Every structure is written in C-alpha cells, then in structure tokens.
C-alpha cells in the first residue's frame, strides 16, 4: 500500500475549527471482514473522495455472502449539496452486507445542508463520529510514510476533538 | 384578507398520492394566542418553498415574545428535508420556544426521497404533524377560499386517501 507524505497528513487532518481551509478532503479507508483492503483517496477533478471510494468497491471483490465493516478516517464530514451523502446512502441500501463507520476530523459546514448529510447518513446506518487523538495517531501509524517516527500532536488536538464531537452529537441527537 | 380561487384550492389540496403533480405548495395558516389572530395563505415563489416564506413573514405579525402562540399550517405537501425546510423549521422553533406548531398535510411529499426524515425532525422539534381529513378540507374551503356561499364538494376517494396517508404518517412517527 502506498503511504502518504507526512506533511500532507498534518495539513489535511489538523482539526482546528477556526482555520479557513481549502475544500480538499483526504479519506483513509480500511475494510474488515466479519479481506483487509486499505488505502487513501482525495478529491480529484470535481469527484469527491467519498464517491471515488464507492467507485473502487467493485475492485475489492467483496463476497455478497460475507459481512464487512468499512471504516473511513476522513478529514471533512461528507457534503449534501454535491451528492456525496446521497450516493453513500444509495450504496448502503444496495449493499446491506456492508456496515460503514465514518470518523471525521472536521465538520464540513461550508455546505448549507451539512446537518442533513450527517442526519441522513446516520438514518441509513452509518456510524458517524469525530476523530480523537487515538484515531489520529492510528492513522499516522498506518497510512503515513513516517519512517518509524511517532505521531506528534498539533496544538489543542484534544480540545478541538471534544468541541467538534459535542457539536456533532447535538446535530444527531 | 384575500381569498383563494376555488379551482386553485381543489387542484392543490386533492389528496390522491399517485397523481403526477407540479412541485407547487399552498400553505393556509392561522396564528392565535393561547391562554390576536392572523390568517392567510402562501405558495412557493421563484424557488422559495411556502414554508420558508411563512417564516419570512413572522416578524411582520408582531408577535409578543412573552405570550404563547399556536400556529396551524394547512399545507398541501408535507415539508421537505432535502431542500432545507424541516431544518429551517426546527431552527425557528428552537429560537421561538413560545410557538406551538401544528402541521396538517394534504399529502406526504413523496417527491423527496428523504421525506421521512423531515417528518421525524419536525416531530422531534415539537411540531404536531397530521394528515388532513374531510373535516380539515371543508374547514379550509369554508375559511380560505372565495367560495361565494357554495358548500365543500369532496373529490373521489378523499376519505380513503386520508386514512391511508394517515396510516403511513403514524407508522413513520411511531
Ligand atoms: Zn461531497
Ligand atoms: Zn421544502
């Protein structure tokens, strides 16, 4: 599996919510059978990382008779107004042997309907939560070309995660 | 104030759910204080759904923030999810805790794939959502329509459609 540049990880997964950022998304994924496929994806030429993950599901050749858990570690929560939540809902309805967990570093409130995205994905069976220190370091250790160097947290990581988690839990309550 | 044309009422509040319709909405409203009345109707205009146009006019009603008000919507379609109506109504009710909102819908907005999420979100926000029955159609005819003394005439299957839709709604909200 090809490993991500460390600078790319840190700049995209920093969870300080008061920074204006570009609308790029990185999506680290793992699939577990209940196979083990793993990798990462970004938005490319108008196609959001979430839909690019859906595009490659056929190449994973999942057994329809087997149950799989798909985990996304994603730098932004999925949008509504550009079709991501809708395509992801359709995929879950069409592939009931798949259970999806979405762990988001930040909430994508640049979309006016971002709350509708989170709420509808929850209703479709996705488990949506905000990334914590544990997940950030796991991603550093798993998807990043770190050359044996340990994860070094950015300032306020824990406070930002708890603040965003409280906001997400209020949206979904 | 101003009364609706009868053909406009009949074509917009017909409750046959299997009819291909234009995505226009009519919303007849009543506002009363509980222990001061406003009434009117609204449709979608230039893309803005009637529900949001009602929220737009709340300031001009000059409601006392200290008093409780019951707002009743007789609305031809239940409010949508995918274009933001349910979310905007939830925000308004959270910001205006002295409003008690009752939504009586002629039809369920099946054109929205996420219509069930809208209904559940409105219930969770404190709105009482129900399906219009013969009683409500006739009340609206008697109240909001330029009927010139003519009685309400039901369309085919009115009662059957209302009970079927009511059963769907109650199952969604159980
Ligand atoms: Zn998207
Ligand atoms: Zn709407």
Author numbering:
A (entry chain B): 190 to 223, 232 to 241, 250 to 378
B (entry chain A): 190 to 224, 232 to 241, 250 to 378
Please give sentences taken from the publication describing this entry.
The APOBEC3 family of single-stranded DNA (ssDNA) cytosine deaminases plays important roles in innate immunity against viruses and transposons. The active site has a catalytically essential zinc ion coordinated by two cysteines (Cys284 and Cys289) and a histidine (His253), with the fourth position of tetrahedral coordination available for directly interacting with the transition state of the hydrolytic cytosine deamination reaction.
Loops 1 and 7 of A3B(187–378)QM_Δloop3 in the new crystal form show different conformations from those observed previously. In both A and B chains of the new structures, the loop 1 residue Arg211 is flipped out and, instead, the adjacent residue Arg212 projects into the DNA-binding groove and interacts with loop 7 Tyr315. In contrast, Tyr315 in chain B shows an alternative conformation differing by a rotation about the Cα-Cβ bond, in which the Tyr315 side chain is flipped away from loop 1 (χ1 ≈ 180°, trans). However, in our new apo A3Bctd crystal form, Tyr315 in this alternative conformation maintains the cation-π stacking interaction with the guanidinium group of Arg212. Accordingly, Arg212 in B chain is positioned differently from that in A chain, but is still blocking the ssDNA-binding groove. Of note, the two datasets we collected using different cryo-protectants showed a slight difference in the conformation of Tyr315 in the B chain. In the new crystal form, Arg210 is released and flipped out, replaced by Arg311 that in turn occupies the pocket between α1 and Trp281. The three distinct conformations of the loops 1 and 7 observed in the apo (DNA-free) A3B(187–378)QM_Δloop3 structures collectively represent possible modes of regulated ssDNA access to the A3B active site, in which the closed state of either loop 1 or 7 (or both together) is incompatible with substrate binding.
